[PDB]
Structure formats: structure tokens, C-alpha cells
Ligand binder design. Structure first.
Ligand SMILES: Nc1ncnc2c1ncn2[C@@H]1O[C@H](COP(=O)(O)OP(=O)(O)O)[C@@H](O)[C@H]1O
Ligand SMILES: [Zn+2]
Ligand SMILES: [Zn+2]
Lengths: 179, 379, 138, 167
């Protein structure tokens, strides 16, 4: 709201360990294969399944409530297996959002309730708008905005994304405290 | 020298590409998606303030020169195709945008009708331009446009889109998907122009003269009991997903008739050729009649060229045109590119001529000095 | 940029044309002392690239190829980047289930090399007209 | 009231309620919401369910007419059927060889055939039988297109047999 990030008070129940905060409400079925190296946030009722995964997330990663990050299955003639996805640094997944994406780049703002397709690659410094469908096996270049049910080039982003996005994710993390 | 770019700014669609090519590289709706506005504003709009028009054209030309075409604007020349009697302030603005902001080397303001003639190769021909706003005709005799014997009527895309909207609202039968299996009239107050255009293209067609003449008298109901031909089957068209509009068979073949209807005045798209040709010089009559050209996307409508050429030969026998244009052989030219992209193709053929282009075209150095674009009005 | 409403508080530019824009969008000019907008500044062309198969193409190759990638294709029905599927290759979309088999294009033995667009029907008539007008313009 | 079948890798951690009738070779993913409110949920072999998938037989909650005498409305589902991420479903009869896409809201009485796919993020409340081997794409409009051949998804299901153990 007018550049400034607003207050969000968390409850007592949340798994805070080595900077990484993960809501107890949010199930993450397969805790072994999933890994959170940095000071990540995972909001309540969110899913990070371990269906033969290697879900590596960023330094300041944010996943809002009711949102799912599942790896896609690669339809290979040699052997059909689930491809391990790698969420980049400073990644912001918005609320109620579906992600079946392989290799999500750093410094990205994925919009609200937007379905990303199977085996979908996202390069760094991009932005997917809200109520948008990226089809299976699609690529989005840097400094781009993809939107619509087709999921196609809408326009370009501001030049200063790399520097700006840092402030957003770090401010949200700092502003997001217990009550 | 570099291959000069060709742009053709229209109300419905803009043609864009490079000179010495078989057709245009990009053809897109002439609109811009501004932040806040739900429906995108139209880039060409006649009779508005210059500053507001300048901003829209600046926004549009930017999209053409970077997103659609990929080339530096300052490097290579421009060939701006625009119809004769295009509003003064609009053409003045369009040039001022290209010369000031983009800093183009030189613009050439070619009339669409003379460009359409080059594509065929014939030096003299009659040219009808059934566009979005107005269906204009202009006789071209051996390179010289005859402005004396001009002709225009508002029987294009806009007039056809409006006629379709009116007819659909009368016989309105939509299946919303909320106990609306039964015929529900006018659930939506207005239908968006994007939908109406898609219905027109896919569903509606141009009827034969014999069947059309019956349709005219049928809807009139001039002291006759159900004297209409059997219509085509009713086509169901989806509106915004769930809502399914059942388009009546009568609407498909009646909507077009407003173009070819006489309406007492004796002013149709057909009559406009013969009205112009009768006003032409006596020596030029037989050459122009033999060489007819039908450009514009409105004439793409299926079975338009057959109805027009037939309606011509019927209106010839009518006593007004029977004396002068009685024993004349009307033959249509088939241009190499499609009816929509005839105008553009001429500018590309002209753009390929680097030697003549530089001389005829207005240089930026001249415009910066003078600030006076040459027109067919007095200097 | 979008999450926080950068499109609220705006900075003004000095010159002929005054514009109200967010600081995120604007650029500072160091040669002189006056920040200028994306509108005010002049735009150039550096490099061309495909959004699917990210391959930096030179300016000369683009003019020959009409600003297009040879390997990648976009579906006609919906506007999305197609994918090569085998059984010996057919082109198919992910969003809509439009295939290359539907329109009746034959499957190619080689993956990328086989696929092509038909020549323009009025290409021979075109060159003859140019050469006529070229001689006449001369 | 549960009819669990051997071979089917239904995960215990997924939520199930009512008079369920489980299929031979079905593979239910965790947090998959299946309810048998009025009638039973009949499942065909190879009918895998992924992520959020609201499958209810609550026509008594939807309408509540107090009509059709008993009105069991038993939820019949076919074989080799992929339920994707966040897709709402409520179909009394559903055919074999059909794949609803992610966040696809299927109607209250919509009957699915073979080789038929619902569009991702597309909602269809209107009751209308789907033609044989036809796909729907987009939310803004339905834009129906007939497919050349039906698409099978057997290999995917078969591999999950190996994964689900120790999860
Ligand atoms: N291929 C086509 N088939 C049928 N109708 C078309 C086709 N292309 C355009 N049209 C219709 O005819 C009109 C042609 O207008 P156009 O000549 O492109 O614009 P302008 O007259 O402003 O240059 C469009 O508005 C559209 O309604
Ligand atoms: Zn490519
Ligand atoms: Zn497609």
C-alpha cells in the first residue's frame, strides 16, 4: 500500500529454525527430499510434496496460503520419473497459486491463483500476473510479463527488478513477526 | 540504403512490414492497452485534441517498430499509406510524431487507391475501397487520381457491425446456463465490437442478387404474404464461455443487404462505382469500366465480388445509367495479394524503388525548416 | 514493483514534455543533471532472441529469416510455443490439443530440418513487377 | 462404511468420508477430498486423484428438493482418469479415458466420454453431455476442438506403485 509493506502478525504455532519459518497448518509430505537453505516463509494450508523431488528454495523465499509446489513427471521413453524442481533466490509465490514447474528462476513474482504447467522453465527477473495459465513446457524470458488463459507475452517489466525485488521479500520477512 | 518500412494506419486494422516483400509481416487491431482502461482505446480517432491523439500514435508506432517489427526507426525511411481525404490534423499529427519523436529520415504520404493500382501493373483502373468507416471510390487514370469524380458512403465495417448488433437484439435467443435453455432476450444491454466482428466473419455471408432482391422486398412486406426465400440453418455462437447465443438464419443473409439496399436515394456500394464513372471524362469511360479494382477487408466477405458485379450490371439497365453506361463491359481485376493487403503491397512495391522514393518523399531536414507537409489542398 | 503499489507516488521530469512516472520506471542521466522518463528517452535495437529456445541471433540473419526462429513454432489455433512429439515426429500444443496431423502435414524423418512453410503463391509475379518499376524509376 | 480393494495404492493420510466404494488400481494423492454424502463414490481401476479434488455426492445439499423418491444418484467414475491439481468435480456418471486439467470446475450434471479434456482454470456449471473425443481450452471462452485420437495415461499411474511406499 503506497510502496510501504504492511504488518502481518503470525500465531504461536509455526516451525522457526535457522531463520526458516514454516506454518504447522501447511503439510509438506516428504520432509527428507525437500530442502530450505535460507530464511524462507511457507504460509498455512500450503503443499510441498516429496513425490521423488529435490525442492531447493531461495535465501528469502515466500509462499502465501493455499498454494502448492509439486514437481512434474517427465514422459521419457527410457524411464518415466518426477523431475526435481529448483526454486531460485528471492522467489515470491502468491496466494492460492498452483506450481507444476521445473527450474523456477531467482527474483520472480508468481501471481495469485495462477496455474503454471508441467515441465515449465522460468528464467530470472520475470512476473506472472494473477488469474493466468502457463501451459506445459513453456519458457518466459527475463524482464517479461506473461498473462491470459493462453499464457503469452503481455509486455516488459521495470528495468530495476534485481535491486527492487530484494527490498520486497526481505521487508515482508522482517515485517512478518509473531503477535 | 536500407529496405524502407511500410505502415497503413486504419480504424479496424493496421498493415506493417518491409518493402520488396510478398505481403505484410504484421497485421493487428489498431488499439493500445493503457493501464486503468478495461477496453483498449482506438489509436486513430478523428475530431479530438492534438495532444491526446499525439500520445496514442506515439504509443502505437512504438509497439509497431519494436514488438511487431524489430528495427531502429532513425536508420531507415517510412512509406505511410493513408486514404485520400484523410482528416488534415490527423495526417499532420502522424507526420509530426514520426519526424519529432522517432526522428525518421523521410515519410511518403501515398494515397491507398494509387498504390492498389501498382500491384496489378495496369496504369489506369477504377478503385473501390470498402473499409471500416466509409466505402470510398476514386478513378485513377494513367497515374493521375481524379479527385473531381470522387465518391464515398458510410456502408463499411462500422455500419455493418451496428446493423448486426441491432438485428441480434430484436431476435435475441441466448442460453446463459441458469435455467436459460428457454429463449432469453437482451440479458446483456450491448455486445462488444470484438464479438460482433467474429460473428460477421464466420456466420454471415453475402447472398446472390436474385435471392437478395427477394430478401429486400420480404422484410419490407410490401403488400405480400410471406414472400421470403428459405434461410440457412441457425448457428449457435458462445458468448463469454457459458452464454450460448443462437444466431437466426435470417440475420446472416439480411445484415449484409444494408450495403446493397437502394433506400430511395439510389445510394448503395454498387451504385457508387456507376455514380463516379458517369461523372468521369467521356474519353476515360471505357478504359476505367474494363479495369475495376475491389480492395478493403469488407469486400473479403464471402460472395461479395459476385453480388457487386451482378448488382452493377442490374443498375446499368436502370433508366438513369442506361443512356451513358448502357453498352459497357465491366470486368474485375484479381490482385496478387488478398483484398485486405492490396493497399500495403503497393507501398512495398513503391518502397523497393530507392531512387524515386528519396526524391518524392518529404525529408526531416525540410519539415524541421518549413513545418508544412504537402497536401492536395492549396499551399 | 506491482505487489507494493509503485504506481502511486510519482516523480516529475524537466524538458519540453512533463510526465508523472514512478521512480522504478524512470532513469537518471549522469552526463548532465536531469532525470528523464522511458517516454522522453530515444529507444534503440541491440539483439534479437527467441522466447522458447533462447538463442541470440544476429541482425543480418533476422532480415533473411523475417524476424523468426527456424527450430521453434507457435500454434495457430491458440498463441503458444509448440512441442515436437514422436510415435517419426508430429507438432502438438499443451494448452489446446491441436496437432500438425489435424491440418494434414506429413510427419518428418529428421526432427527440425524437415519442417517448412510453403512458398508464397504470388512471389514470381512480385519480382517481375519490381524489376519493371525499377527500370521505369531509373 | 469403506470397501478398500487390494492393488489400489490409496494413501491413508488423504481424507475420506461416507459410504465409499474404492476401485481395483486407483492411486489417491494426499489432501484429496472425497465425500459420499447421499450416494456412494464408485471408482474405476486407474482413476488416480492428484492434490485438491473436491468429489462430493451432495445433490441433497446443492438443490434439496425432497423429490425423486430416494434419489441415491450414485457417483460412477470410469477407468484411466487423471484428476489434476485443484479441479472441482460432481458428475453422477463419468466415462473412461478422460483428463480434467488443474483448477477445472466440472458442473453438477456433466457426463464425460473418452479422449475428452476440460481446460485449465476453466469453469463449466451448465449441464451438457460432452461429445466423443473433444477437448475444451480457456476460461474466457470454451472454444471446443475435436481431438484426432484419445490420449492414454497408464505409464504415469504404474510408476506411482514404486514412489508411494515410505510416504
Ligand atoms: N479476412 C477478412 N475476412 C472478412 N472480413 C474481414 C477480413 N479482414 C477484415 N475484415 C473486415 O473488414 C474490415 C476491413 O477494414 P480495413 O480495411 O482493415 O480498415 P481501414 O479501412 O481502416 O484501413 C474490418 O473492420 C473487418 O470488419
Ligand atoms: Zn526458438
Ligand atoms: Zn494451440
Amino acid at each position: 500500500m503506497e510502496l510501504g509493506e504492511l504488518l502481518y502478525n503470525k500465531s504461536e504455532y509455526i516451525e522457526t529454525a535457522s531463520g526458516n519459518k514454516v506454518s504447522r497448518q501447511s503439510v509438506l509430505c516428504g520432509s527428507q527430499n525437500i530442502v530450505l537453505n535460507g530464511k524462507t516463509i511457507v504460509m498455512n494450508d500450503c503443499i510441498i510434496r516429496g513425490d521423488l523431488a529435490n525442492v531447493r528454495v531461495g535465501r528469502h523465499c515466500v509462499v502465501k496460503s493455499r498454494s502448492v509446489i509439486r514437481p512434474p513427471f517427465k514422459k521419457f521413453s527410457k524411464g518415466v520419473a518426477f523431475f526435481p524442481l529448483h526454486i531460485g533466490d528471492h522467489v515470491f509465490i502468491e496466494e492460492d497459486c498452483v506450481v507444476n514447474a521445473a527450474q523456477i528462476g531467482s527474483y520472480v513474482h508468481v501471481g495469485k491463483n495462477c496455474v503454471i504447467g508441467r515441465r515449465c522453465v522460468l528464467k530470472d527477473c520475470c512476473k506472472i500476473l494473477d488469474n493466468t495459465v502457463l501451459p506445459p513446457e513453456t519458457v518466459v524470458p527475463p524482464f517479461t510479463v506473461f498473462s491470459g488463459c493462453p499464457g503469452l507475452f503481455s509486455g516488459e517489466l521495470p528495468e530495476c527488478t534485481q535491486e527492487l525485488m530484494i527490498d520486497v521479500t526481505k521487508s515482508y520477512y522482517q515485517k512478518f513477526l509473531p503477535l | 540504403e536500407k529496405t524502407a518500412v511500410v505502415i497503413d494506419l486504419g480504424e479496424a486494422f493496421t498493415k506493417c512490414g518491409f518493402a520488396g516483400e510478398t505481403g505484410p509481416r504484421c497485421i493487428i487491431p489498431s488499439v493500445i492497452k493503457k493501464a486503468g482502461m478495461p477496453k483498449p482505446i482506438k489509436v486513430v480517432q478523428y475530431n479530438i485534441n492534438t495532444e491526446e491523439l499525439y500520445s496514442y500514435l506515439k504509443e502505437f508506432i512504438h509497439i509497431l517498430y519494436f514488438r511487431h517489427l524489430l528495427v531502429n526507426p532513425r536508420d531507415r525511411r517510412v512509406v505511410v499509406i493513408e486514404s485520400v481525404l484523410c482528416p488534415s490534423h490527423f495526417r499532420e499529427t502522424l507526420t509530426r510524431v514520426l519526424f519529432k519523436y522517432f526522428e525518421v529520415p523521410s515519410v511518403l504520404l501515398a494515397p491507398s487507391h494509387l498504390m492498389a493500382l501498382l500491384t496489378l501493373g495496369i496504369n489506369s483502373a477504377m478503385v473501390l475501397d470498402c473499409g471500416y468507416r466509409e466505402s470510398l471510390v476514386l478513378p485513377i487514370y494513367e497515374g493521375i487520381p481524379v479527385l473531381n469524380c470522387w465518391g464515398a458512403l458510410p456502408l463499411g465495417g462500422k455500419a455493418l457491425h451496428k446493423e448486426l448488433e441491432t438485428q441480434l437484439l430484436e431476435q435475441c435467443t441466448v442460453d446463459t446456463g441458469a435455467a436459460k435453455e428457454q429463449s432469453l432476450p437482451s440479458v446483456m444491454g450491448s455486445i462488444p465490437e470484438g464479438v460482433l466482428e467474429d460473428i460477421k466473419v464466420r456466420t454471415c455471408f453475402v447472398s446472390d442478387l436474385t435471392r437478395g432482391l427477394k430478401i429486400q422486398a420480404a422484410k419490407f412486406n410490401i403488400d405480400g404474404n410471406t414472400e421470403r426465400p428459405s434461410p440457412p440453418p441457425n448457428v449457435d455462437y458462445p458468448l463469454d464461455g457459458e452464454k450460448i447465443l443462437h444466431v437466426l438464419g435470417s440475420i446472416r443473409d439480411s445484415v449484409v443487404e444494408i450495403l446493397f439496399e437502394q433506400d430511395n436515394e439510389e445510394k448503395s456500394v454498387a451504385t457508387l462505382i456507376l455514380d463516379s464513372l458517369m461523372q468521369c471524362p467521356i474519353d476515360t469511360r471505357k478504359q476505367l469500366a474494363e479495369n475495376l479494382v475491389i480492395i478493403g477487408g469488407t469486400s473479403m466477405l464471402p460472395g461479395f465480388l459476385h453480388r457487386l458485379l451482378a448488382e452493377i450490371r442490374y443498375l446499368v439497365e436502370k433508366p438513369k445509367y442506361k443512356k451513358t453506361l448502357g453498352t459497357k463491359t465491366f470486368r474485375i481485376h484479381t490482385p496478387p495479394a488478398k483484398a485486405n493487403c492490396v493497399a500495403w503491397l503497393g507501398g512495398a512495391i513503391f518502397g523497393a524503388l530507392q531512387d524515386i522514393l528519396g526524391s518524392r518523399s518529404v525529408s526531416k531536414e525540410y519539415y524541421n525548416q518549413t513545418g508544412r507537409i504537402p497536401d492536395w489542398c492549396s499551399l | 514493483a506491482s505487489l507494493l503499489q509503485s504506481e502511486r507516488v510519482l516523480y516529475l521530469v524537466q524538458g519540453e514534455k512533463k510526465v508523472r512516472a514512478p521512480l522504478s520506471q524512470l532513469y537518471f542521466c549522469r552526463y548532465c543533471s536531469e532525470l528523464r522518463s522511458l517516454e522522453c528517452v530515444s529507444h534503440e535495437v541491440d539483439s534479437h532472441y527467441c522466447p522458447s529456445c533462447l538463442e541470440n541471433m544476429p541482425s543480418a540473419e533476422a532480415k533473411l529469416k523475417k524476424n523468426r526462429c527456424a527450430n521453434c513454432f507457435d500454434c495457430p489455433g491458440c498463441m503458444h510455443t509448440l512441442s515436437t512429439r514422436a510415435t517419426a515426429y508430429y507438432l502438438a500444443c499443451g494448452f489446446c490439443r491441436w496437432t500438425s496431423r489435424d491440418v494434414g502435414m506429413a510427419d518428418k524423418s529428421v526432427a527440425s530440418g524437415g519442417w517448412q512453410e510453403p512458398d508464397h503463391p504470388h512471389t514470381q509475379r512480385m519480382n517481375k513487377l519490381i524489376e519493371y518499376y525499377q527500370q521505369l524509376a531509373q | 462404511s469403506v470397501k478398500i480393494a487390494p492393488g489400489a495404492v490409496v494413501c491413508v493420510e488423504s481424507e475420506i468420508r461416507g459410504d465409499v466404494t474404492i476401485g481395483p488400481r486407483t492411486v489417491i494423492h494426499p489432501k484429496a477430498r472425497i465425500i459420499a454424502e447421499a450416494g456412494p463414490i464408485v471408482i474405476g481401476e486407474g482413476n488416480l486423484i492428484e492434490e485438491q479434488a473436491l468429489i462430493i455426492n451432495a445433490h441433497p445439499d446443492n438443490i434439496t428438493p425432497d423429490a425423486e423418491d430416494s434419489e441415491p444418484k450414485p457417483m460412477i467414475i470410469g477407468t484411466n482418469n487423471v484428476f489434476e491439481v485443484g479441479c472441482y468435480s460432481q458428475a453422477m456418471k463419468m466415462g473412461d479415458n478422460n483428463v480434467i486439467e488443474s483448477k477445472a470446475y466440472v458442473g453438477r450434471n456433466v457426463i464425460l466420454t473418452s479422449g475428452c479434456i476440460i481446460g485449465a482454470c476453466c469453469n463449466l456449471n451448465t449441464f451438457e453431455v460432452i461429445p466423443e473425443n473433444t477437448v475444451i481450452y480457456g476460461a474466457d471462452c470454451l472454444r471446443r476442438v475435436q481431438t484426432e485420437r484419445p490420449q492414454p495415461q497408464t505409464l504415469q499411474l504404474d510408476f506411482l506403485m514404486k514412489i508411494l511406499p515410505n510416504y
